[PDB]
Amino acid sequence: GGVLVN
Amino acid sequence: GGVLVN
Amino acid sequence: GGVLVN
Amino acid sequence: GGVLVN
Amino acid sequence: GGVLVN
Amino acid sequence: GGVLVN
Ligand SMILES: [Zn+2]
Ligand SMILES: [Zn+2]
Ligand SMILES: [Zn+2]
Ligand SMILES: [Zn+2]
Ligand SMILES: [Zn+2]
Ligand SMILES: [Zn+2]
């Protein structure tokens, strides 16, 4: 899956 | 905010 | 699954 | 914000 | 923000 | 998956 740390 | 379409 | 830390 | 389309 | 189309 | 650190 994707990981987005905004 | 962030947008994650997995 | 995806991980979003906003 | 960031956009991630995985 | 960044845009990542994976 | 992709990793976006924004
Ligand atoms: Zn993953
Ligand atoms: Zn936003
Ligand atoms: Zn996952
Ligand atoms: Zn943005
Ligand atoms: Zn931008
Ligand atoms: Zn990966």
Side-chain angles (χ1 to χ4, degrees):
Chain A
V3 179
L4 204 191
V5 184
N6 189 57
Chain B
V3 179
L4 204 191
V5 184
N6 189 57
Chain C
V3 179
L4 204 191
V5 184
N6 189 57
Chain D
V3 179
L4 204 191
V5 184
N6 189 57
Chain E
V3 179
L4 204 191
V5 184
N6 189 57
Chain F
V3 179
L4 204 191
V5 184
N6 189 57

PDB file of all heavy atoms in Angstrom:
ATOM      1  N   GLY A   1       0.841  -1.233   0.000  1.00  0.00           N
ATOM      2  CA  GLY A   1       0.000   0.000   0.000  1.00  0.00           C
ATOM      3  C   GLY A   1       0.853   1.250   0.000  1.00  0.00           C
ATOM      4  O   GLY A   1       2.066   1.181   0.193  1.00  0.00           O
ATOM      5  N   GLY A   2       0.220   2.396  -0.222  1.00  0.00           N
ATOM      6  CA  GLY A   2       0.920   3.670  -0.196  1.00  0.00           C
ATOM      7  C   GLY A   2       1.044   4.262   1.196  1.00  0.00           C
ATOM      8  O   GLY A   2       0.216   4.003   2.072  1.00  0.00           O
ATOM      9  N   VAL A   3       2.082   5.074   1.384  1.00  0.00           N
ATOM     10  CA  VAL A   3       2.309   5.796   2.631  1.00  0.00           C
ATOM     11  C   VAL A   3       2.444   7.278   2.309  1.00  0.00           C
ATOM     12  O   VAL A   3       3.327   7.675   1.545  1.00  0.00           O
ATOM     13  CB  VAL A   3       3.582   5.305   3.356  1.00  0.00           C
ATOM     14  CG1 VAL A   3       3.809   6.099   4.638  1.00  0.00           C
ATOM     15  CG2 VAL A   3       3.483   3.820   3.662  1.00  0.00           C
ATOM     16  N   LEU A   4       1.549   8.083   2.875  1.00  0.00           N
ATOM     17  CA  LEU A   4       1.577   9.525   2.703  1.00  0.00           C
ATOM     18  C   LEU A   4       1.716  10.158   4.086  1.00  0.00           C
ATOM     19  O   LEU A   4       0.815  10.050   4.919  1.00  0.00           O
ATOM     20  CB  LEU A   4       0.292  10.003   2.020  1.00  0.00           C
ATOM     21  CG  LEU A   4       0.283  11.320   1.235  1.00  0.00           C
ATOM     22  CD1 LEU A   4      -1.157  11.700   0.884  1.00  0.00           C
ATOM     23  CD2 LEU A   4       0.958  12.459   1.975  1.00  0.00           C
ATOM     24  N   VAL A   5       2.860  10.793   4.329  1.00  0.00           N
ATOM     25  CA  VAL A   5       3.064  11.611   5.520  1.00  0.00           C
ATOM     26  C   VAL A   5       2.983  13.059   5.047  1.00  0.00           C
ATOM     27  O   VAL A   5       3.900  13.567   4.399  1.00  0.00           O
ATOM     28  CB  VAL A   5       4.415  11.309   6.194  1.00  0.00           C
ATOM     29  CG1 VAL A   5       4.556  12.099   7.490  1.00  0.00           C
ATOM     30  CG2 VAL A   5       4.542   9.825   6.470  1.00  0.00           C
ATOM     31  N   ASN A   6       1.864  13.709   5.355  1.00  0.00           N
ATOM     32  CA  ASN A   6       1.517  14.985   4.738  1.00  0.00           C
ATOM     33  C   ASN A   6       2.210  16.169   5.398  1.00  0.00           C
ATOM     34  O   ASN A   6       2.644  16.092   6.551  1.00  0.00           O
ATOM     35  CB  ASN A   6       0.004  15.189   4.775  1.00  0.00           C
ATOM     36  CG  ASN A   6      -0.437  16.387   3.968  1.00  0.00           C
ATOM     37  OD1 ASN A   6      -0.154  16.477   2.772  1.00  0.00           O
ATOM     38  ND2 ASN A   6      -1.127  17.320   4.617  1.00  0.00           N
TER      39      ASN A   6
ATOM     40  N   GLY B   1      -5.024  19.348   3.196  1.00  0.00           N
ATOM     41  CA  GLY B   1      -4.794  17.959   3.689  1.00  0.00           C
ATOM     42  C   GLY B   1      -4.281  17.059   2.586  1.00  0.00           C
ATOM     43  O   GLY B   1      -4.285  17.438   1.415  1.00  0.00           O
ATOM     44  N   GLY B   2      -3.835  15.865   2.957  1.00  0.00           N
ATOM     45  CA  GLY B   2      -3.363  14.892   1.985  1.00  0.00           C
ATOM     46  C   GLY B   2      -4.476  14.046   1.392  1.00  0.00           C
ATOM     47  O   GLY B   2      -5.512  13.827   2.022  1.00  0.00           O
ATOM     48  N   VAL B   3      -4.240  13.561   0.175  1.00  0.00           N
ATOM     49  CA  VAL B   3      -5.159  12.661  -0.512  1.00  0.00           C
ATOM     50  C   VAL B   3      -4.393  11.411  -0.919  1.00  0.00           C
ATOM     51  O   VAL B   3      -3.411  11.491  -1.661  1.00  0.00           O
ATOM     52  CB  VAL B   3      -5.780  13.320  -1.765  1.00  0.00           C
ATOM     53  CG1 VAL B   3      -6.711  12.345  -2.478  1.00  0.00           C
ATOM     54  CG2 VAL B   3      -6.527  14.588  -1.388  1.00  0.00           C
ATOM     55  N   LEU B   4      -4.831  10.264  -0.408  1.00  0.00           N
ATOM     56  CA  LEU B   4      -4.235   8.982  -0.740  1.00  0.00           C
ATOM     57  C   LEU B   4      -5.323   8.105  -1.356  1.00  0.00           C
ATOM     58  O   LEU B   4      -6.286   7.735  -0.683  1.00  0.00           O
ATOM     59  CB  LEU B   4      -3.660   8.322   0.516  1.00  0.00           C
ATOM     60  CG  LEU B   4      -2.531   7.291   0.396  1.00  0.00           C
ATOM     61  CD1 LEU B   4      -2.323   6.596   1.743  1.00  0.00           C
ATOM     62  CD2 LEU B   4      -2.776   6.264  -0.691  1.00  0.00           C
ATOM     63  N   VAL B   5      -5.175   7.801  -2.643  1.00  0.00           N
ATOM     64  CA  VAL B   5      -6.017   6.820  -3.319  1.00  0.00           C
ATOM     65  C   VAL B   5      -5.154   5.572  -3.478  1.00  0.00           C
ATOM     66  O   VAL B   5      -4.242   5.534  -4.307  1.00  0.00           O
ATOM     67  CB  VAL B   5      -6.520   7.340  -4.678  1.00  0.00           C
ATOM     68  CG1 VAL B   5      -7.479   6.340  -5.312  1.00  0.00           C
ATOM     69  CG2 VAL B   5      -7.202   8.681  -4.506  1.00  0.00           C
ATOM     70  N   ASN B   6      -5.433   4.564  -2.656  1.00  0.00           N
ATOM     71  CA  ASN B   6      -4.528   3.432  -2.490  1.00  0.00           C
ATOM     72  C   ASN B   6      -4.682   2.386  -3.585  1.00  0.00           C
ATOM     73  O   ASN B   6      -5.718   2.308  -4.252  1.00  0.00           O
ATOM     74  CB  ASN B   6      -4.750   2.782  -1.126  1.00  0.00           C
ATOM     75  CG  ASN B   6      -3.706   1.739  -0.806  1.00  0.00           C
ATOM     76  OD1 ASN B   6      -2.508   2.029  -0.805  1.00  0.00           O
ATOM     77  ND2 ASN B   6      -4.151   0.514  -0.538  1.00  0.00           N
TER      78      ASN B   6
ATOM     79  N   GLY C   1      -2.847  -2.178   2.979  1.00  0.00           N
ATOM     80  CA  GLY C   1      -3.687  -0.946   2.979  1.00  0.00           C
ATOM     81  C   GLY C   1      -2.835   0.305   2.979  1.00  0.00           C
ATOM     82  O   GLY C   1      -1.621   0.236   3.173  1.00  0.00           O
ATOM     83  N   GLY C   2      -3.468   1.451   2.758  1.00  0.00           N
ATOM     84  CA  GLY C   2      -2.767   2.725   2.783  1.00  0.00           C
ATOM     85  C   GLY C   2      -2.643   3.317   4.176  1.00  0.00           C
ATOM     86  O   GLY C   2      -3.471   3.057   5.052  1.00  0.00           O
ATOM     87  N   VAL C   3      -1.606   4.129   4.363  1.00  0.00           N
ATOM     88  CA  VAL C   3      -1.378   4.851   5.610  1.00  0.00           C
ATOM     89  C   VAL C   3      -1.243   6.332   5.288  1.00  0.00           C
ATOM     90  O   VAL C   3      -0.361   6.730   4.524  1.00  0.00           O
ATOM     91  CB  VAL C   3      -0.105   4.360   6.335  1.00  0.00           C
ATOM     92  CG1 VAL C   3       0.122   5.153   7.618  1.00  0.00           C
ATOM     93  CG2 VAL C   3      -0.204   2.874   6.642  1.00  0.00           C
ATOM     94  N   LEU C   4      -2.138   7.137   5.855  1.00  0.00           N
ATOM     95  CA  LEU C   4      -2.111   8.579   5.682  1.00  0.00           C
ATOM     96  C   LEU C   4      -1.971   9.212   7.065  1.00  0.00           C
ATOM     97  O   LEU C   4      -2.873   9.104   7.898  1.00  0.00           O
ATOM     98  CB  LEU C   4      -3.395   9.057   4.999  1.00  0.00           C
ATOM     99  CG  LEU C   4      -3.405  10.375   4.215  1.00  0.00           C
ATOM    100  CD1 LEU C   4      -4.845  10.754   3.864  1.00  0.00           C
ATOM    101  CD2 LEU C   4      -2.729  11.513   4.954  1.00  0.00           C
ATOM    102  N   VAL C   5      -0.828   9.848   7.308  1.00  0.00           N
ATOM    103  CA  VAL C   5      -0.623  10.665   8.499  1.00  0.00           C
ATOM    104  C   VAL C   5      -0.705  12.113   8.027  1.00  0.00           C
ATOM    105  O   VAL C   5       0.212  12.621   7.378  1.00  0.00           O
ATOM    106  CB  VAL C   5       0.728  10.363   9.173  1.00  0.00           C
ATOM    107  CG1 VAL C   5       0.868  11.153  10.469  1.00  0.00           C
ATOM    108  CG2 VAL C   5       0.854   8.879   9.449  1.00  0.00           C
ATOM    109  N   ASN C   6      -1.824  12.763   8.335  1.00  0.00           N
ATOM    110  CA  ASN C   6      -2.170  14.039   7.717  1.00  0.00           C
ATOM    111  C   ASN C   6      -1.478  15.223   8.377  1.00  0.00           C
ATOM    112  O   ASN C   6      -1.043  15.146   9.530  1.00  0.00           O
ATOM    113  CB  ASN C   6      -3.683  14.243   7.754  1.00  0.00           C
ATOM    114  CG  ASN C   6      -4.124  15.441   6.948  1.00  0.00           C
ATOM    115  OD1 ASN C   6      -3.842  15.531   5.751  1.00  0.00           O
ATOM    116  ND2 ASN C   6      -4.814  16.375   7.597  1.00  0.00           N
TER     117      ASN C   6
ATOM    118  N   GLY D   1      -1.337  20.294   0.216  1.00  0.00           N
ATOM    119  CA  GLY D   1      -1.107  18.905   0.709  1.00  0.00           C
ATOM    120  C   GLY D   1      -0.594  18.004  -0.394  1.00  0.00           C
ATOM    121  O   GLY D   1      -0.598  18.384  -1.565  1.00  0.00           O
ATOM    122  N   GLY D   2      -0.147  16.811  -0.022  1.00  0.00           N
ATOM    123  CA  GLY D   2       0.324  15.837  -0.994  1.00  0.00           C
ATOM    124  C   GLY D   2      -0.788  14.992  -1.588  1.00  0.00           C
ATOM    125  O   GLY D   2      -1.825  14.773  -0.957  1.00  0.00           O
ATOM    126  N   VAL D   3      -0.552  14.506  -2.804  1.00  0.00           N
ATOM    127  CA  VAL D   3      -1.472  13.607  -3.492  1.00  0.00           C
ATOM    128  C   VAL D   3      -0.705  12.357  -3.898  1.00  0.00           C
ATOM    129  O   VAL D   3       0.276  12.437  -4.641  1.00  0.00           O
ATOM    130  CB  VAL D   3      -2.092  14.265  -4.745  1.00  0.00           C
ATOM    131  CG1 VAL D   3      -3.024  13.291  -5.457  1.00  0.00           C
ATOM    132  CG2 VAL D   3      -2.840  15.533  -4.367  1.00  0.00           C
ATOM    133  N   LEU D   4      -1.144  11.209  -3.387  1.00  0.00           N
ATOM    134  CA  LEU D   4      -0.547   9.927  -3.719  1.00  0.00           C
ATOM    135  C   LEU D   4      -1.636   9.051  -4.336  1.00  0.00           C
ATOM    136  O   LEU D   4      -2.599   8.681  -3.662  1.00  0.00           O
ATOM    137  CB  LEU D   4       0.027   9.267  -2.463  1.00  0.00           C
ATOM    138  CG  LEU D   4       1.157   8.237  -2.583  1.00  0.00           C
ATOM    139  CD1 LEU D   4       1.364   7.541  -1.236  1.00  0.00           C
ATOM    140  CD2 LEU D   4       0.912   7.209  -3.670  1.00  0.00           C
ATOM    141  N   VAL D   5      -1.487   8.747  -5.622  1.00  0.00           N
ATOM    142  CA  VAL D   5      -2.330   7.766  -6.298  1.00  0.00           C
ATOM    143  C   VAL D   5      -1.467   6.518  -6.457  1.00  0.00           C
ATOM    144  O   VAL D   5      -0.555   6.479  -7.286  1.00  0.00           O
ATOM    145  CB  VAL D   5      -2.832   8.285  -7.658  1.00  0.00           C
ATOM    146  CG1 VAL D   5      -3.792   7.285  -8.292  1.00  0.00           C
ATOM    147  CG2 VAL D   5      -3.514   9.627  -7.485  1.00  0.00           C
ATOM    148  N   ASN D   6      -1.745   5.510  -5.636  1.00  0.00           N
ATOM    149  CA  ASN D   6      -0.840   4.377  -5.469  1.00  0.00           C
ATOM    150  C   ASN D   6      -0.994   3.331  -6.564  1.00  0.00           C
ATOM    151  O   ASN D   6      -2.030   3.254  -7.232  1.00  0.00           O
ATOM    152  CB  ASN D   6      -1.062   3.728  -4.105  1.00  0.00           C
ATOM    153  CG  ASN D   6      -0.019   2.685  -3.785  1.00  0.00           C
ATOM    154  OD1 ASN D   6       1.179   2.975  -3.785  1.00  0.00           O
ATOM    155  ND2 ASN D   6      -0.463   1.460  -3.517  1.00  0.00           N
TER     156      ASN D   6
ATOM    157  N   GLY E   1       2.350  21.239  -2.763  1.00  0.00           N
ATOM    158  CA  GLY E   1       2.581  19.850  -2.270  1.00  0.00           C
ATOM    159  C   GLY E   1       3.094  18.950  -3.373  1.00  0.00           C
ATOM    160  O   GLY E   1       3.090  19.329  -4.544  1.00  0.00           O
ATOM    161  N   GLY E   2       3.540  17.756  -3.001  1.00  0.00           N
ATOM    162  CA  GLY E   2       4.011  16.783  -3.973  1.00  0.00           C
ATOM    163  C   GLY E   2       2.899  15.937  -4.567  1.00  0.00           C
ATOM    164  O   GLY E   2       1.862  15.718  -3.937  1.00  0.00           O
ATOM    165  N   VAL E   3       3.135  15.452  -5.784  1.00  0.00           N
ATOM    166  CA  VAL E   3       2.215  14.552  -6.471  1.00  0.00           C
ATOM    167  C   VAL E   3       2.982  13.302  -6.878  1.00  0.00           C
ATOM    168  O   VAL E   3       3.964  13.383  -7.620  1.00  0.00           O
ATOM    169  CB  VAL E   3       1.595  15.211  -7.724  1.00  0.00           C
ATOM    170  CG1 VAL E   3       0.663  14.237  -8.437  1.00  0.00           C
ATOM    171  CG2 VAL E   3       0.848  16.479  -7.346  1.00  0.00           C
ATOM    172  N   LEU E   4       2.543  12.155  -6.367  1.00  0.00           N
ATOM    173  CA  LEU E   4       3.140  10.873  -6.699  1.00  0.00           C
ATOM    174  C   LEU E   4       2.051   9.997  -7.315  1.00  0.00           C
ATOM    175  O   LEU E   4       1.088   9.627  -6.642  1.00  0.00           O
ATOM    176  CB  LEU E   4       3.715  10.213  -5.442  1.00  0.00           C
ATOM    177  CG  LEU E   4       4.844   9.183  -5.562  1.00  0.00           C
ATOM    178  CD1 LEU E   4       5.052   8.487  -4.216  1.00  0.00           C
ATOM    179  CD2 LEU E   4       4.599   8.155  -6.650  1.00  0.00           C
ATOM    180  N   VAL E   5       2.200   9.693  -8.602  1.00  0.00           N
ATOM    181  CA  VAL E   5       1.358   8.712  -9.277  1.00  0.00           C
ATOM    182  C   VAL E   5       2.221   7.464  -9.436  1.00  0.00           C
ATOM    183  O   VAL E   5       3.133   7.425 -10.265  1.00  0.00           O
ATOM    184  CB  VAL E   5       0.855   9.231 -10.637  1.00  0.00           C
ATOM    185  CG1 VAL E   5      -0.105   8.231 -11.271  1.00  0.00           C
ATOM    186  CG2 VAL E   5       0.173  10.573 -10.464  1.00  0.00           C
ATOM    187  N   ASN E   6       1.942   6.456  -8.615  1.00  0.00           N
ATOM    188  CA  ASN E   6       2.847   5.323  -8.448  1.00  0.00           C
ATOM    189  C   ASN E   6       2.693   4.277  -9.544  1.00  0.00           C
ATOM    190  O   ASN E   6       1.657   4.200 -10.211  1.00  0.00           O
ATOM    191  CB  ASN E   6       2.625   4.674  -7.084  1.00  0.00           C
ATOM    192  CG  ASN E   6       3.669   3.630  -6.765  1.00  0.00           C
ATOM    193  OD1 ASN E   6       4.866   3.920  -6.764  1.00  0.00           O
ATOM    194  ND2 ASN E   6       3.224   2.406  -6.497  1.00  0.00           N
TER     195      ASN E   6
ATOM    196  N   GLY F   1       4.528  -0.287  -2.979  1.00  0.00           N
ATOM    197  CA  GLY F   1       3.687   0.946  -2.979  1.00  0.00           C
ATOM    198  C   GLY F   1       4.540   2.196  -2.979  1.00  0.00           C
ATOM    199  O   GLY F   1       5.753   2.127  -2.786  1.00  0.00           O
ATOM    200  N   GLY F   2       3.907   3.342  -3.201  1.00  0.00           N
ATOM    201  CA  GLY F   2       4.608   4.616  -3.176  1.00  0.00           C
ATOM    202  C   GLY F   2       4.732   5.208  -1.783  1.00  0.00           C
ATOM    203  O   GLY F   2       3.904   4.949  -0.907  1.00  0.00           O
ATOM    204  N   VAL F   3       5.769   6.020  -1.596  1.00  0.00           N
ATOM    205  CA  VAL F   3       5.996   6.742  -0.349  1.00  0.00           C
ATOM    206  C   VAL F   3       6.131   8.223  -0.670  1.00  0.00           C
ATOM    207  O   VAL F   3       7.014   8.621  -1.434  1.00  0.00           O
ATOM    208  CB  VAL F   3       7.270   6.251   0.377  1.00  0.00           C
ATOM    209  CG1 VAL F   3       7.497   7.044   1.659  1.00  0.00           C
ATOM    210  CG2 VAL F   3       7.170   4.766   0.683  1.00  0.00           C
ATOM    211  N   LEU F   4       5.237   9.029  -0.104  1.00  0.00           N
ATOM    212  CA  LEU F   4       5.264  10.471  -0.276  1.00  0.00           C
ATOM    213  C   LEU F   4       5.404  11.104   1.107  1.00  0.00           C
ATOM    214  O   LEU F   4       4.502  10.996   1.940  1.00  0.00           O
ATOM    215  CB  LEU F   4       3.980  10.949  -0.959  1.00  0.00           C
ATOM    216  CG  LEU F   4       3.970  12.266  -1.744  1.00  0.00           C
ATOM    217  CD1 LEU F   4       2.530  12.646  -2.095  1.00  0.00           C
ATOM    218  CD2 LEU F   4       4.645  13.404  -1.004  1.00  0.00           C
ATOM    219  N   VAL F   5       6.547  11.739   1.349  1.00  0.00           N
ATOM    220  CA  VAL F   5       6.752  12.556   2.540  1.00  0.00           C
ATOM    221  C   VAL F   5       6.670  14.005   2.068  1.00  0.00           C
ATOM    222  O   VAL F   5       7.587  14.513   1.419  1.00  0.00           O
ATOM    223  CB  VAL F   5       8.103  12.255   3.214  1.00  0.00           C
ATOM    224  CG1 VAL F   5       8.243  13.045   4.510  1.00  0.00           C
ATOM    225  CG2 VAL F   5       8.229  10.770   3.491  1.00  0.00           C
ATOM    226  N   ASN F   6       5.551  14.654   2.376  1.00  0.00           N
ATOM    227  CA  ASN F   6       5.205  15.930   1.758  1.00  0.00           C
ATOM    228  C   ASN F   6       5.897  17.114   2.418  1.00  0.00           C
ATOM    229  O   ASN F   6       6.332  17.038   3.571  1.00  0.00           O
ATOM    230  CB  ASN F   6       3.692  16.135   1.796  1.00  0.00           C
ATOM    231  CG  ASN F   6       3.251  17.333   0.989  1.00  0.00           C
ATOM    232  OD1 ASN F   6       3.533  17.422  -0.207  1.00  0.00           O
ATOM    233  ND2 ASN F   6       2.560  18.266   1.638  1.00  0.00           N
TER     234      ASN F   6
HETATM  235 ZN    ZN G   1       2.779  -0.712   0.837  1.00  0.00          ZN
HETATM  236 ZN    ZN G   2      -5.339  19.244   1.046  1.00  0.00          ZN
HETATM  237 ZN    ZN G   3      -0.908  -1.657   3.816  1.00  0.00          ZN
HETATM  238 ZN    ZN G   4      -1.651  20.189  -1.934  1.00  0.00          ZN
HETATM  239 ZN    ZN G   5       2.036  21.135  -4.913  1.00  0.00          ZN
HETATM  240 ZN    ZN G   6       6.467   0.234  -2.142  1.00  0.00          ZN
END
